[PDB]
Scaffold this active site. Structure first.
Site, PDB file in Angstrom:
ATOM      1  N   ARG A 103      -5.862 -48.766   8.730  1.00  0.00           N
ATOM      2  CA  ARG A 103      -6.557 -48.206   7.280  1.00  0.00           C
ATOM      3  C   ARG A 103      -4.705 -48.498   6.390  1.00  0.00           C
ATOM      4  O   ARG A 103      -5.084 -48.697   5.026  1.00  0.00           O
ATOM      5  CB  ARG A 103      -6.091 -46.551   7.526  1.00  0.00           C
ATOM      6  CG  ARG A 103      -7.477 -45.667   7.909  1.00  0.00           C
ATOM      7  CD  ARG A 103      -7.627 -44.251   8.673  1.00  0.00           C
ATOM      8  NE  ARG A 103      -9.431 -44.065   8.635  1.00  0.00           N
ATOM      9  CZ  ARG A 103      -8.593 -42.355   8.620  1.00  0.00           C
ATOM     10  NH1 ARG A 103      -8.445 -41.472   8.699  1.00  0.00           N
ATOM     11  NH2 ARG A 103     -10.142 -42.321   9.771  1.00  0.00           N
ATOM     12  N   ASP A 163     -11.562 -30.342   0.571  1.00  0.00           N
ATOM     13  CA  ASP A 163     -11.338 -29.787   1.836  1.00  0.00           C
ATOM     14  C   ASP A 163     -11.093 -28.256   1.713  1.00  0.00           C
ATOM     15  O   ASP A 163     -12.252 -28.008   2.735  1.00  0.00           O
ATOM     16  CB  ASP A 163      -9.817 -30.413   2.202  1.00  0.00           C
ATOM     17  CG  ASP A 163      -9.087 -31.858   1.882  1.00  0.00           C
ATOM     18  OD1 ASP A 163      -9.287 -31.984   1.500  1.00  0.00           O
ATOM     19  OD2 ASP A 163      -8.737 -32.215   3.471  1.00  0.00           O
ATOM     20  N   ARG A 166     -14.771 -27.013   0.330  1.00  0.00           N
ATOM     21  CA  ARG A 166     -15.975 -27.977   2.379  1.00  0.00           C
ATOM     22  C   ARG A 166     -15.725 -26.448   2.962  1.00  0.00           C
ATOM     23  O   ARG A 166     -16.532 -25.803   3.796  1.00  0.00           O
ATOM     24  CB  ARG A 166     -15.289 -28.417   3.509  1.00  0.00           C
ATOM     25  CG  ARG A 166     -16.513 -29.253   2.515  1.00  0.00           C
ATOM     26  CD  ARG A 166     -15.815 -31.543   3.016  1.00  0.00           C
ATOM     27  NE  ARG A 166     -17.486 -32.099   2.945  1.00  0.00           N
ATOM     28  CZ  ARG A 166     -16.636 -33.828   2.650  1.00  0.00           C
ATOM     29  NH1 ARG A 166     -15.347 -33.760   2.560  1.00  0.00           N
ATOM     30  NH2 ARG A 166     -17.831 -34.553   2.244  1.00  0.00           N
ATOM     31  N   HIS A 190      -4.819 -34.797   1.930  1.00  0.00           N
ATOM     32  CA  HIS A 190      -6.206 -34.758   2.523  1.00  0.00           C
ATOM     33  C   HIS A 190      -6.393 -35.809   3.211  1.00  0.00           C
ATOM     34  O   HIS A 190      -5.943 -36.293   3.281  1.00  0.00           O
ATOM     35  CB  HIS A 190      -6.666 -35.248   1.181  1.00  0.00           C
ATOM     36  CG  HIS A 190      -7.687 -35.832   0.962  1.00  0.00           C
ATOM     37  ND1 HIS A 190      -8.699 -34.453   0.954  1.00  0.00           N
ATOM     38  CD2 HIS A 190      -8.282 -36.916   1.090  1.00  0.00           C
ATOM     39  CE1 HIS A 190     -10.532 -35.152   1.533  1.00  0.00           C
ATOM     40  NE2 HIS A 190      -9.595 -36.666   1.215  1.00  0.00           N
TER      41      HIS A 190
HETATM   42  N1  LIG Z   1     -10.899 -37.720  -2.599  1.00  0.00           N
HETATM   43  C1  LIG Z   1     -11.352 -37.359  -1.965  1.00  0.00           C
HETATM   44  O1  LIG Z   1     -12.006 -35.938  -1.666  1.00  0.00           O
HETATM   45  C2  LIG Z   1     -12.820 -38.612  -1.426  1.00  0.00           C
HETATM   46  C3  LIG Z   1     -14.103 -38.510  -1.106  1.00  0.00           C
HETATM   47  C4  LIG Z   1     -14.765 -39.397  -1.129  1.00  0.00           C
HETATM   48  C5  LIG Z   1     -14.176 -40.287  -0.905  1.00  0.00           C
HETATM   49  N2  LIG Z   1     -13.041 -41.171  -1.992  1.00  0.00           N
HETATM   50  C6  LIG Z   1     -12.391 -41.386  -2.212  1.00  0.00           C
HETATM   51  O2  LIG Z   1     -13.043 -42.832  -3.669  1.00  0.00           O
HETATM   52  C7  LIG Z   1     -12.928 -43.911  -3.731  1.00  0.00           C
HETATM   53  C8  LIG Z   1     -14.083 -44.440  -3.540  1.00  0.00           C
HETATM   54  O3  LIG Z   1     -15.574 -44.567  -2.995  1.00  0.00           O
HETATM   55  P1  LIG Z   1     -17.360 -44.899  -3.154  1.00  0.00           P
HETATM   56  O4  LIG Z   1     -18.062 -44.419  -2.636  1.00  0.00           O
HETATM   57  O5  LIG Z   1     -17.494 -44.847  -4.625  1.00  0.00           O
HETATM   58  O6  LIG Z   1     -16.614 -46.737  -2.997  1.00  0.00           O
HETATM   59  P2  LIG Z   1     -16.926 -47.730  -3.791  1.00  0.00           P
HETATM   60  O7  LIG Z   1     -17.152 -48.943  -2.862  1.00  0.00           O
HETATM   61  O8  LIG Z   1     -19.079 -46.936  -3.805  1.00  0.00           O
HETATM   62  O9  LIG Z   1     -17.211 -48.170  -5.222  1.00  0.00           O
HETATM   63  C9  LIG Z   1     -15.432 -48.630  -4.993  1.00  0.00           C
HETATM   64  C10 LIG Z   1     -16.667 -49.095  -6.686  1.00  0.00           C
HETATM   65  O10 LIG Z   1     -14.272 -49.612  -6.951  1.00  0.00           O
HETATM   66  C11 LIG Z   1     -14.571 -50.672  -8.059  1.00  0.00           C
HETATM   67  N3  LIG Z   1     -13.890 -51.641  -7.862  1.00  0.00           N
HETATM   68  C12 LIG Z   1     -13.210 -52.539  -7.192  1.00  0.00           C
HETATM   69  N4  LIG Z   1     -11.979 -53.121  -7.259  1.00  0.00           N
HETATM   70  C13 LIG Z   1     -11.798 -53.189  -9.109  1.00  0.00           C
HETATM   71  C14 LIG Z   1     -11.082 -52.628  -9.842  1.00  0.00           C
HETATM   72  N5  LIG Z   1      -9.944 -53.759  -9.660  1.00  0.00           N
HETATM   73  N6  LIG Z   1     -10.988 -51.867 -10.889  1.00  0.00           N
HETATM   74  C15 LIG Z   1     -13.183 -51.227 -11.409  1.00  0.00           C
HETATM   75  N7  LIG Z   1     -13.268 -51.284 -10.521  1.00  0.00           N
HETATM   76  C16 LIG Z   1     -12.340 -51.372  -9.144  1.00  0.00           C
HETATM   77  C17 LIG Z   1     -15.749 -51.381  -6.865  1.00  0.00           C
HETATM   78  O11 LIG Z   1     -16.390 -52.306  -7.853  1.00  0.00           O
HETATM   79  C18 LIG Z   1     -16.984 -50.940  -6.524  1.00  0.00           C
HETATM   80  O12 LIG Z   1     -17.605 -50.215  -7.475  1.00  0.00           O
HETATM   81  C19 LIG Z   1     -13.064 -44.294  -2.524  1.00  0.00           C
HETATM   82  O13 LIG Z   1     -11.230 -45.205  -2.055  1.00  0.00           O
HETATM   83  C20 LIG Z   1     -13.012 -43.614  -1.488  1.00  0.00           C
HETATM   84  O14 LIG Z   1     -11.964 -43.230  -0.021  1.00  0.00           O
HETATM   85  C21 LIG Z   1     -11.852 -40.095  -2.415  1.00  0.00           C
HETATM   86  O1  LIG Z   2     -15.684 -37.143   2.407  1.00  0.00           O
HETATM   87  C1  LIG Z   2     -15.007 -37.434   2.513  1.00  0.00           C
HETATM   88  N1  LIG Z   2     -15.415 -39.127   3.384  1.00  0.00           N
HETATM   89  C2  LIG Z   2     -14.583 -39.859   2.938  1.00  0.00           C
HETATM   90  C3  LIG Z   2     -15.029 -41.546   2.806  1.00  0.00           C
HETATM   91  C4  LIG Z   2     -16.055 -41.870   1.973  1.00  0.00           C
HETATM   92  C5  LIG Z   2     -16.662 -43.073   1.721  1.00  0.00           C
HETATM   93  S1  LIG Z   2     -16.219 -43.868   3.043  1.00  0.00           S
HETATM   94  C6  LIG Z   2     -15.462 -42.402   3.891  1.00  0.00           C
HETATM   95  C7  LIG Z   2     -14.432 -40.012   4.795  1.00  0.00           C
HETATM   96  C8  LIG Z   2     -15.112 -39.700   5.977  1.00  0.00           C
HETATM   97  C9  LIG Z   2     -15.077 -38.888   6.558  1.00  0.00           C
HETATM   98  C10 LIG Z   2     -13.299 -39.489   7.102  1.00  0.00           C
HETATM   99  C11 LIG Z   2     -12.587 -40.691   6.393  1.00  0.00           C
HETATM  100  O2  LIG Z   2     -10.960 -41.080   6.737  1.00  0.00           O
HETATM  101  C12 LIG Z   2     -10.496 -41.931   5.576  1.00  0.00           C
HETATM  102  C13 LIG Z   2      -9.378 -41.498   5.206  1.00  0.00           C
HETATM  103  C14 LIG Z   2      -8.686 -42.253   4.501  1.00  0.00           C
HETATM  104  C15 LIG Z   2      -9.545 -43.483   3.983  1.00  0.00           C
HETATM  105  F1  LIG Z   2      -8.583 -44.443   3.247  1.00  0.00           F
HETATM  106  C16 LIG Z   2     -10.666 -44.086   4.638  1.00  0.00           C
HETATM  107  C17 LIG Z   2     -10.973 -43.507   5.602  1.00  0.00           C
HETATM  108  N2  LIG Z   2     -12.785 -40.843   4.909  1.00  0.00           N
HETATM  109  C18 LIG Z   2     -13.149 -39.978   2.548  1.00  0.00           C
HETATM  110  C19 LIG Z   2     -13.049 -39.006   1.874  1.00  0.00           C
HETATM  111  O3  LIG Z   2     -11.904 -38.147   1.883  1.00  0.00           O
HETATM  112  C20 LIG Z   2     -13.521 -37.216   2.599  1.00  0.00           C
HETATM  113  S2  LIG Z   2     -12.677 -35.782   2.165  1.00  0.00           S
HETATM  114  C21 LIG Z   2     -12.354 -35.681   3.731  1.00  0.00           C
HETATM  115  C22 LIG Z   2     -12.228 -36.965   4.622  1.00  0.00           C
HETATM  116  C23 LIG Z   2     -11.368 -36.349   6.683  1.00  0.00           C
HETATM  117  C24 LIG Z   2     -11.338 -35.638   6.749  1.00  0.00           C
HETATM  118  C25 LIG Z   2     -11.865 -34.355   5.889  1.00  0.00           C
HETATM  119  C26 LIG Z   2     -12.470 -34.311   4.494  1.00  0.00           C
HETATM  120 CL1  LIG Z   2     -12.555 -32.832   3.922  1.00  0.00          CL
END
Ligand SMILES: NC(=O)c1ccc[n+]([C@@H]2O[C@H](COP(=O)([O-])OP(=O)(O)OC[C@H]3O[C@@H](n4cnc5c(N)ncnc54)[C@H](O)[C@@H]3O)[C@@H](O)[C@H]2O)c1
Ligand SMILES: O=C1N[C@](c2ccsc2)(c2cccc(Oc3ccc(F)cc3)n2)CC(O)=C1Sc1ccccc1Cl
Ligand SMILES: NC(=O)c1ccc[n+]([C@@H]2O[C@H](COP(=O)([O-])OP(=O)(O)OC[C@H]3O[C@@H](n4cnc5c(N)ncnc54)[C@H](O)[C@@H]3O)[C@@H](O)[C@H]2O)c1
Ligand SMILES: NC(=O)c1ccc[n+]([C@@H]2O[C@H](COP(=O)([O-])OP(=O)(O)OC[C@H]3O[C@@H](n4cnc5c(N)ncnc54)[C@H](O)[C@@H]3O)[C@@H](O)[C@H]2O)c1
Ligand SMILES: NC(=O)c1ccc[n+]([C@@H]2O[C@H](COP(=O)([O-])OP(=O)(O)OC[C@H]3O[C@@H](n4cnc5c(N)ncnc54)[C@H](O)[C@@H]3O)[C@@H](O)[C@H]2O)c1
Ligand SMILES: O=C1N[C@](c2ccsc2)(c2cccc(Oc3ccc(F)cc3)n2)CC(O)=C1Sc1ccccc1Cl
Ligand SMILES: O=C1N[C@](c2ccsc2)(c2cccc(Oc3ccc(F)cc3)n2)CC(O)=C1Sc1ccccc1Cl
Lengths: 329, 328, 323, 322
Positions: A103, A163, A166, A190
């Site tokens: 990570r 979080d 959920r 988070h």
């Molecule tokens: N905060 C939360 O609770 C939460 C929950 C779910 C996912 N996430 C996060 O959101 C992010 C995206 O998730 P995802 O499933 O959509 O991933 P994804 O791989 O499906 O999409 C990522 C996008 O980012 C784009 N990207 C990469 N480099 C780029 C750049 N330099 N400029 C513009 N775009 C660029 C990719 O081309 C891609 O389309 C991840 O980091 C993931 O962990 C956060």
């Molecule tokens: O729902 C979600 N799907 C996630 C994801 C989305 C696309 S790939 C991974 C997901 C899930 C499980 C672990 C996980 O671990 C990580 C944490 C940081 C990292 F850089 C990569 C993976 N990530 C990103 C994310 O932050 C959430 S919310 C969540 C995650 C863990 C515990 C509780 C909550 Cl509420």
């Protein structure tokens, strides 16, 4: 003359007023986009990505639904000129985690992506609010803040919003009550290290901890601690089952966007610069309940935590600073 | 229990505005999110054959409950989950690969329908069927034949999307919102669809009257190209992102809205057009229909030019050609 | 110490300017229906109310504020002083007691300078009757370009027409298209040529549409539009809900820059042989800069003459006004 | 043939039963505010209006019908005859003329007429005194207690949250606080449940809601009562705030949301109350009305105000003929 000229008499010749930009059109970015469009939060939507084919296709698919929407302009491009004068810029861009890969590896890989994005966003929208979704959201919010040079009120991390969302859903399911009427706060870092604040959990002002003093302890017969454990479990479960999470995060982001765009001043669990609170002396971003509006985070709610809850937050802040000090900017 | 200490139970009812989505692919899920954000149902049921995807999609929607007004989201492979649905939306099925025609999917989607339709009708005998799976016009006919439902309760998404796309393109050319740009794309959803140039207007001002060359090869402005752009639209989107989801999700929720709210709005949808425009076969294609709580209660008899009526019967002849070679 | 300070830690000092502010002038039955409709459509981040009756004004503001829990407009303000209306994107004028053009011109002479002083970049939306004359009056007093001065005009006439059309055909008014243009009220013009359902011209299907030899008497639908206005006033004493809703719909296009086409009163000098500074309803493209464009409707000699007659009448009254 | 027949080909004859019908009884300022709010929230596929003043009733119906183009409620009906109300899911009573016997007499005519046309409806009572009149509606209708709901302390609670919000610089949605018991002057602010983000205001400030309080938070509840009298003094009545609060209750009922609201319910068995009395407690609201109640733990003082209200209400209720 043209059919347009035969039918229409032009009165005026010649900026967007409520523009929102989404950076990264992956599953998270697109769910944020559709949710924002269906909530009428913007008069203009801009989409940015590095994959040009996918980007154009996503823009076109949204544009084909214009008849059913109230957002008259949908634009996209690799060039950040399309983002100019955005009120709010949502960052969902990120590297795809490699098999085996640590990570800390992903952190830096996303920092490298942010080193290109953040200066480009700030150049075209210097007065925007930044909403960070990309993981690790707490570290990347700090990264966005450092690169941009923006005051901390205009750099918001989605943090513990999902979080908490959920947690409330699971609470609701256990009690047979709508999540809107189930109150509970998940704070700090988070993900895996998030802190459920058992003292604040209630239905109609009735404290669950007062009714059941064993709430959130191992001494609990009902094992309410499992409701927080399930929050963590559900994230891994959704990823195991469908490969990613999109709908729940998209919805939670549109909710934050609503408070900012409409200046609602609602309280949300979002990631903010918490240096000076709970014994934290480093520049770290963690989730606390924040008042959200047109200038981003204007205020924070001072939650009284137990020694255990405060220690957990301190430990998370030490871990985040450990990564943050070794990052290459 | 803490639940008993906190809550006193007073009562020990059937869902009132239940919607089922069959097929949780990109189309099904876009239909689901669009319906959820429009508050059209008190209960949403999801069905698919893929276990993992189904549960994951249900859970992802459930985790967004705090931001929604649909208190019950359920899923299952067993159609007992769909019981007493007012509206059942079918999005299950094989989709086009880059360049592939929708007619190429007919055989395998007809088999999929042979399993789905009896299961849906068994648990919701009084529902309205909304068909999205391609070829939508043929699959609507298939759903009608298998179900044994009256034609009013079997609706195909049809040219609703084609008309929305046409209106978007019209809007972009005129600098007017698509809502204020009126134009109808009728017949087959796809390559043989018919743009009705005579009915194209802004504020009741006929574009064909103002520009008699509209939709003709003599047109210097080449307005016929707007319809080509509509024909090609899915192929272009499929080439760029691999599928279409958002636009169809939005157009289905619009149809779901008129049905669930009994609005009696006029929409271009797949329907049994036998008796119209000289068609004597059980052909299903798009004409403007009045949509409400009993599905299609009425049809708008559009006056078509010689050439426009020609093009519509060409569309009908193509669809009937495929339809006739089908064993139930 | 305060409980607010014990509970909330302040990060930011200075509270900024409203971004999507709407003002309603005159808190009568029309003004309040305009207010509730705009509030329930989430068009504004701030709502300002103005009237001369201070008690009613405060009571109306307080009643709206008490519903905040169910709304998404975080700031509701009111006052007799126009300082409360500062930086409004849209100002809706429903002011004056519900012939009366001279008393209404005189209150406009007080209101309009006060509104423009506090919101120099606003769009003006005139509802007060006679709406066509009063829109011209607002335009003259404000000094605003014609695009930023909109009269509600034939929007309500058209909405009523579409409702009646809908009821006759068993189709929702949204799917029934028809335009009532020109002078708002008794002198309005139903454009029979543009009446359609699904692009199917009613006049083409029934050439007798809107004529006296029509056995179905479709001319009576327009007659009913006029009759319904008098009927509503006879039955409840005023109209509020229908006008409130129609104004919120205009507010939506403006606030969201939708560029939808609406039948609203605009400066029609140069059209249909009109050479005077007259405001009449034509289909207008409505967005963030008000009326940016107008649809050139093809009218019959009779329809065109009716607009010219209305324009001569309105100019006759207007010519004698002093600013 | 008619233009309608030339343009439209009819497939179906039979046009039956409304699925999500709402009736409003009493088209006064409260009734009409409830009507417009319900119409703008798309809660119904059919709206019915009833009153005794026929001209006003038709005028109000027509004014709403003229706005159909901007709405998603395709059928708006009205009449003095309750046949217009048939098969309503929800019936909202805002009709009204110490005052209790005059309203009881109005209710003796209304409630039987509503129940015969909509036997399975939920009754939502707004008419004052709402707590007594909810009991009256329950007795006349013969409906189980779950299907007879009083608007109760919903407005009191909403006003409280607005005032809390103004004091803290927070949106009322994020300000939590419950006003229970008897609607109006005798309402009980539950100081223990007041919080922002789960942070108890009483824990942070133990003097909250007592006379010992230097910040005088008791005055917020006093202001709730003060504001009601003020609005009536300033504009003569209240309409918008109540119409909005009723539309919120209508939403949880019509959509079976199972949200918790402070509404009037039969509280016999709670807080030492042994009489058939309706007063506000937090209730789970859905398609079958009040399915569940939240058991709020009250202080000696809070419980005493609630029992005192119940004794007073029963005193009036026993001295009523119907
Ligand atoms: N905060 C939360 O609770 C939460 C929950 C779910 C996912 N996430 C996060 O959101 C992010 C995206 O998730 P995802 O499933 O959509 O991933 P994804 O791989 O499906 O999409 C990522 C996008 O980012 C784009 N990207 C990469 N480099 C780029 C750049 N330099 N400029 C513009 N775009 C660029 C990719 O081309 C891609 O389309 C991840 O980091 C993931 O962990 C956060
Ligand atoms: O729902 C979600 N799907 C996630 C994801 C989305 C696309 S790939 C991974 C997901 C899930 C499980 C672990 C996980 O671990 C990580 C944490 C940081 C990292 F850089 C990569 C993976 N990530 C990103 C994310 O932050 C959430 S919310 C969540 C995650 C863990 C515990 C509780 C909550 Cl509420
Ligand atoms: N305008 C339109 O009508 C329109 C527009 C776009 C797509 N489509 C059509 O919608 C359909 C689906 O598109 P998609 O992108 O979601 O495909 P998809 O591959 O993403 O999903 C299809 C789903 O159907 C499921 N499925 C297959 N057999 C099933 C069964 N027997 N029961 C239940 N579910 C089953 C699959 O498991 C899969 O989840 C296609 O036929 C496509 O052509 C129609
Ligand atoms: N354009 C339309 O289709 C349409 C439809 C209905 C009504 N109207 C018009 O809208 C106007 C208002 O209707 P109403 O029923 O609300 O009348 P109303 O008498 O109920 O209310 C008018 C309000 O204007 C206020 N007012 C008077 N002088 C003022 C001043 N100098 N500054 C601020 N406020 C002032 C009054 O105090 C009053 O509150 C009328 O002119 C009416 O004809 C137009
Ligand atoms: N928080 C609350 O619960 C709350 C708040 C405000 C008002 N209210 C109450 O709501 C009621 C109505 O308020 P209002 O301002 O609209 O009063 P109103 O006088 O303006 O209107 C009352 C309507 O009831 C009608 N009515 C009388 N008898 C009738 C009958 N037998 N059948 C049908 N209709 C009949 C009247 O004709 C009138 O139209 C009052 O009792 C009032 O106290 C309750
Ligand atoms: O519905 C309405 N109620 C009215 C009213 C409002 C409060 S008291 C009277 C009303 C009704 C009848 C004539 C009337 O007189 C006038 C006066 C000036 C003028 F420019 C137009 C009509 N006013 C105002 C008004 O403009 C309407 S709409 C309308 C009016 C007449 C015919 C057709 C329509 Cl669509
Ligand atoms: O806002 C409101 N306006 C009211 C009204 C409505 C039309 S005339 C009077 C109002 C206000 C004040 C006292 C008052 O007294 C009465 C009078 C007769 C009766 F049968 C019950 C109460 N009625 C009715 C009402 O119940 C409310 S809410 C409220 C009232 C008092 C304290 C706190 C709150 Cl939350």
């Amino acid at each position: 003359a043209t059919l347009k000229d035969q039918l229409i008499y032009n009165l005026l010749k010649e900026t967007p007023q409520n523009k929102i930009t989404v950076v990264g059109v992956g599953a998270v970015g697109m769910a944020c986009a559709i949710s924002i469009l269906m909530k009428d939060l913007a008069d203009e939507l801009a989409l940015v990505d590095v994959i040009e084919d996918k980007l154009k296709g996503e823009m076109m698919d949204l544009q084909h639904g214009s008849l059913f929407l109230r957002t008259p302009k949908i634009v996209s491009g690799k060039d950040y000129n399309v983002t100019a004068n955005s009120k709010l810029v949502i960052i969902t861009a990120g590297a795809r985690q490699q098999e085996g890969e640590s990570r800390l590896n992903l952190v830096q890989r996303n920092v490298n992506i942010f080193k290109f994005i953040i200066p480009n966003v700030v150049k075209y929208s210097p007065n925007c609010k930044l909403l960070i979704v990309s993981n690790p959201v707490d570290i990347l919010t700090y990264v966005a803040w450092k690169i941009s040079g923006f005051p901390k009120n205009r750099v918001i991390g989605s943090g513990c919003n999902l979080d908490s969302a959920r947690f409330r859903y699971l609470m609701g399911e256990r009690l047979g009550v709508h999540p809107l009427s189930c109150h509970g706060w998940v704070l700090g870092e988070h993900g895996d290290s998030s802190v459920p604040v058992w003292s604040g959990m209630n239905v109609a002002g009735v404290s669950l901890k007062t009714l059941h003093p064993d709430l959130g302890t191992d001494k609990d017969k009902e094992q309410w601690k499992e409701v927080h454990k399930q929050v963590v479990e559900s994230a891994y479960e959704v990823i195991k089952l469908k490969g990613y999470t999109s709908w729940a995060i998209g919805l939670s982001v549109a909710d934050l966007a609503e408070s900012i765009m409409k200046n609602l001043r609602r309280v949300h669990p979002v990631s903010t610069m918490i240096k000076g609170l709970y014994g934290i002396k480093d520049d770290v971003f963690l989730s606390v309940p924040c008042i959200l509006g047109q200038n981003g985070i204007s205020d924070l709610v001072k939650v009284t935590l137990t020694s255990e809850e405060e220690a957990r937050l301190k430990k998370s802040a030490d871990t985040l600073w450990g990564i943050q000090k070794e990052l290459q900017f």
